[PDB]
Amino acid sequence: MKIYGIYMDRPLSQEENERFMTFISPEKREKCRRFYHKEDAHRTLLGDVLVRSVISRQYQLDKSDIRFSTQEYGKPCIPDLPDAHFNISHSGRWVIGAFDSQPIGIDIEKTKPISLEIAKRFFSKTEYSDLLAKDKDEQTDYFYHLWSMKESFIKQEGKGLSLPLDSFSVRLHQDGQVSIELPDSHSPCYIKTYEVDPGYKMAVCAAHPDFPEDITMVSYEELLR
Amino acid sequence: YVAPTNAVESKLAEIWERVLGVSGIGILDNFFQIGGHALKAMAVAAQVHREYQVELPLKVLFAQPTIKALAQYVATR
Ligand SMILES: CC(C)(COP(=O)(O)OP(=O)(O)OC[C@H]1O[C@@H](n2cnc3c(N)ncnc32)[C@H](O)[C@@H]1OP(=O)(O)O)[C@@H](O)C(=O)NCCC(=O)NCCS
Ligand SMILES: [Mg+2]
Ligand SMILES: [Mg+2]
Numbered sequence: 001m002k003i004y005g006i007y008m009d010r011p012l013s014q015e016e017n018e019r020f021m022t023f024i025s026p027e028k029r030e031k032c033r034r035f036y037h038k039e040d041a042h043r044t045l046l047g048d049v050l051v052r053s054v055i056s057r058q059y060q061l062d063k064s065d066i067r068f069s070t071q072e073y074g075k076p077c078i079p080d081l082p083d084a085h086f087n088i089s090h091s092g093r094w095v096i097g098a099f100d101s102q103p104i105g106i107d108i109e110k111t112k113p114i115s116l117e118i119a120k121r122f123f124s125k126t127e128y129s130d131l132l133a134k135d136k137d138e139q140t141d142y143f144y145h146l147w148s149m150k151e152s153f154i155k156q157e158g159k160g161l162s163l164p165l166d167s168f169s170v171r172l173h174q175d176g177q178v179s180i181e182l183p184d185s186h187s188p189c190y191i192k193t194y195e196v197d198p199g200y201k202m203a204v205c206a207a208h209p210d211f212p213e214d215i216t217m218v219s220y221e222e223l224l225r
Numbered sequence: 226y227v228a229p230t231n232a233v234e235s236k237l238a239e240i241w242e243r244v245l246g247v248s249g250i251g252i253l254d255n256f257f258q259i260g261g262h263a264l265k266a267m268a269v270a271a272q273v274h275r276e277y278q279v280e281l282p283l284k285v286l287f288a289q290p291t292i293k294a295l296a297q298y299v300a301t302r
Contacts, residue, residue: 034255034258035258035259036247036254036258036259036260037259037260040258040260074287091262109264117271118264118267118268118271121267121270121271121274122267147264151263160263160287161263161266161283161284161287162283162284162287
């Protein structure tokens, strides 16, 4: 398993943007052009190039050789390279990617105060109860943990939000480990939270427990190679 | 850009504008191209239930992420 991160301390220049556009498919280019907000374009762009860069290095291909598809729920894959399982998430200044020889999910979300209404309506009763147990001091932060942990799972599985959020329960324990309640039956999965930035909650979901201790940062320059 | 043509489209536009912090959304605008993402899709679905007592499955919003489609779904229910 490898986890790479890109921190957007500044916006992409026009040069960088145009150079990054060089690596991607015509379809992906038109998609980036259809974004109303530039930063959404940049996040999607960077994520695409991150996968191209990591997998091209690993298989000794050129970046632009990689051909993406998606399965029925929109999960991206590389049909030519089915052993190269990956997943991307982006929010705010972060673009992050996970890579493994088995299916993998990752999520990061910028925290913003928010009501518990989304948790009440969508999360499992157990999670809602856990959430209500936190002091007001901590409920936003715990909501974003739950959100990113659950999303790491549904992204690993590949169905995303077609999988009801109340069909499984996650818990972040005081020692820092995550537990998941699944009908197993279900194959093993493991969730790790990462603290990469105090304004953000991030988690990764993988088929095995061999996670890296920290993530590897990647610069724009490395990606422009 | 396509302006809303009925009360359900306009209301959904108001809901989307408020969730996304963007003004003047057309009814063919793709939710995910104009700032939408999963967390905000949940907020959209919560406010549709509050407004219309209609359960908006998330997979429906992702499958057809325009106000026109969503209005259709919401109206017929
Ligand atoms: C997957 C998921 C929850 C992402 O939500 P998000 O927080 O808005 O987006 P994130 O920043 O965390 O991740 C974005 C990336 O997730 C990846 N992704 C997209 N769909 C995915 C899926 N079903 N499973 C795993 N990963 C997915 C893509 O790499 C995407 O990057 P891009 O949009 O720049 O190309 C969300 O897109 C989802 O639920 N998708 C499924 C919708 C669905 O059910 N469709 C079926 C209709 S019948
Ligand atoms: Mg995102
Ligand atoms: Mg996400």
